[PDB]
Design an enzyme around this catalytic site. Sequence first.
Site, PDB file in Angstrom:
ATOM      1  N   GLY A  36       0.788  -1.219   0.000  1.00 10.23           N
ATOM      2  CA  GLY A  36       0.000   0.000   0.000  1.00 10.23           C
ATOM      3  C   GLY A  36       0.824   1.275   0.000  1.00 10.23           C
ATOM      4  CB  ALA A  37       2.203   3.369  -2.105  1.00 15.52           C
ATOM      5  CB  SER A  65       3.835  -3.307  -3.007  1.00 15.83           C
ATOM      6  OG  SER A  65       3.824  -2.008  -3.576  1.00 15.83           O
ATOM      7  CB  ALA A  66       5.166  -0.516   0.641  1.00 17.31           C
ATOM      8  CG  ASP A  80       5.763  -6.032 -10.430  1.00 21.65           C
ATOM      9  OD1 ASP A  80       4.741  -5.830  -9.748  1.00 21.65           O
ATOM     10  OD2 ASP A  80       6.567  -6.947 -10.170  1.00 21.65           O
ATOM     11  CG  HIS A 106       2.452  -3.605  -8.210  1.00 27.96           C
ATOM     12  ND1 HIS A 106       3.579  -4.243  -7.746  1.00 27.96           N
ATOM     13  CD2 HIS A 106       2.067  -2.762  -7.223  1.00 27.96           C
ATOM     14  CE1 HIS A 106       3.868  -3.805  -6.534  1.00 27.96           C
ATOM     15  NE2 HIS A 106       2.966  -2.906  -6.193  1.00 27.96           N
TER      16      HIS A 106
END
EC number: 3.1.1.13
Length: 547
Positions: free
Chosen positions: A107-108, A194-195, A320, A435
């Site tokens: 979630g960035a 991701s993050a 991605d 992604h």
Amino acid sequence: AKLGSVYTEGGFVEGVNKKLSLFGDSIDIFKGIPFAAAPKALEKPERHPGWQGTLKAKSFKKRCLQATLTQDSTYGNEDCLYLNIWVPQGRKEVSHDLPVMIWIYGGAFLMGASQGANFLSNYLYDGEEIATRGNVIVVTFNYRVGPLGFLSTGDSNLPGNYGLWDQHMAIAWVKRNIEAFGGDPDNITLFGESAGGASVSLQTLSPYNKGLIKRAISQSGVGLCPWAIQQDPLFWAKRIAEKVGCPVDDTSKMAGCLKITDPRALTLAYKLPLGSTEYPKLHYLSFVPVIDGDFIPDDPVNLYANAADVDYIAGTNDMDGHLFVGMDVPAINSNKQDVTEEDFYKLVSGLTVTKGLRGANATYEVYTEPWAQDSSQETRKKTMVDLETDILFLIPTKIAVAQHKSHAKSANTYTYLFSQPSRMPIYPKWMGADHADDLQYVFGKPFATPLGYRAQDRTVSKAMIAYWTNFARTGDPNTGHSTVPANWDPYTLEDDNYLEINKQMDSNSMKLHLRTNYLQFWTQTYQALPTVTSAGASLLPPEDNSQ
Ligand SMILES: *[C@@H]1O[C@H](CO)[C@@H](O)[C@H](O)[C@H]1NC(C)=O
């Protein structure tokens, strides 16, 4: 069997036992156990003091304070440091000495919740499927996100990385209590996307997690990713103090102000500028971790030493970058919209600003070698996806596995490339994995909610859950509680071998040299070009007031 009331460092905890068959098979599920005390705005977390009596851990607690999608700086509150546990049980006796997998959501770095939320294409994080299908304990928890978790002045006033401290506190509590539930403290494995993939990385490098983490899995995200480290914290630290009335150009007062400013104000002041403008942006996620004095005490690239005895898997989905480039050049399958050469140069420039048009010119040059031409507007659009995939996920990931492989002592190293085509109706026929498309397979959605899932989806999901859990158990993806579809060979700099994950899992799934030539360009040629580091004396050592 049933776990019942477990005694943990803080006191008694009780969850629910969900029966899964007419043969005793059940699963104990605890939710809402606090691993730390309610964190204070922009302040590091403290250990939870305990509680008297029994805690009825039967439901997810508030996710951490964050913004919705447009207005509402609401989704939870500061009191959100909770973890959840899933323990597969037999019938004869209670489970003990089981591998433990702690999941870190993405979630960035701005959105996220253990309660299977805060994500796009995929989001639910229920460990039941993994726990039961791999005979592994699965843990999830909340970590501070947004300004509240990563705001930093870049000095002793506000170091930042509070969100990373929380992740560490979770890992710590698990290390110290997981045996109460039947887990093996020395078999803790971290995984994330991701993050979350980057956080796992950063957590294995941090000196604070010296001997807590046994193995690790990073999906579409790693510590060396251009987006994981904020180079200039103060930059956005001032701008935030600009929107919320705080003494901007006076770090001390600014820090004092922020620390007392309203959480929801602080949260909301950070609005992602995903609007109608093409200035170099749409990947300016300002609140991300930073190199502070201790948690991340130096550039991640020099911290490898810490992950030498940590078995590591790191992978990437073939497209991605698709999700992000689309936000820049909105030509996915827009047949009636064409990408011109200059359009490509324009994207390149923006992506290579720190190296001037020399970098932009070298890059455009290396990336435009193929003769599929205008006629093949597909190829053009194809390369624009390759570009952002390489820059944001692939290159950083290749460097991390190689780096880990070379400095490894007892640890194993495995890398992968997930390529199960995205069947999203709004994307062009050439689409590969975008992604986050991996999530549904890793968490076992095709089984949990088979409705709307082809068998291939269950094939892939069976394989991935098998690889992740075998690895979480033996450090080897090919050995454990489950049957592997194809052999996954340990990484070597010599072969640069990667398992391509999809429906056709066989002997030929192991491949070699994925985009070696681009690894070369970015790491040798490009890197050699003069940088517009040009900042006068605005460099790390000069004018930082001795921290
Ligand atoms: C490429 O950029 C360099 C400056 O970095 C410039 O001298 C040259 O004219 C450019 N060439 C093209 C074809 O854009």
